[PDB]
Amino acid sequence: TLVRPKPLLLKLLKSVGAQKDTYTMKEVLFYLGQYIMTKRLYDEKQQHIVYCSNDLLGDLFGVPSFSVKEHRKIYTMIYRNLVVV
Numbered sequence: 001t002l003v004r005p006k007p008l009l010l011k012l013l014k015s016v017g018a019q020k021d022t023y024t025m026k027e028v029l030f031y032l033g034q035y036i037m038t039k040r041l042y043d044e045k046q047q048h049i050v051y052c053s054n055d056l057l058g059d060l061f062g063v064p065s066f067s068v069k070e071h072r073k074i075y076t077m078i079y080r081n082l083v084v085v
């Protein structure tokens with residue numbers, strides 16, 4: 001499935017090296033995760049928990065924190081920031 005990230009998500013992706021305007025979901029996640037690990041928004045003690053309050057990611061998703069273990073919720077939040085081609 002190819003997707004087109006909306007302006008805010010695209011900015012996020014490109015800030016960690018993304019270069020296209022169109023991506024597969026696996027690529028969106030790849031860069032999104034690189035973004036998270038690069039900024040280290042995860043919690044050192046509980047590494048599956050992500051803190052993104054007052055960050056671009058928080059703006060994007062609409063939440064102050066989330067768990068990378070809830071794939072359905074992450075997929076939901078991501079989909080709101082892209083149009084499926």
Ligand SMILES: CN1C(=O)[C@H](Cc2ccccc2)O[C@@H](c2ccc(Br)cc2)[C@H]1c1ccc(Br)cc1
Nearest residue numbers: 029030032033034036037042047048049068074
């Ligand atoms: C599937 N996946 C990835 O592709 C990347 C891999 C990656 C890591 C470092 C540098 C480049 C790419 O991130 C994974 C990830 C990210 C953050 C945490 Br916390 C756990 C796992 C993980 C992931 C990406 C996005 C979300 Br939201 C949740 C998990």
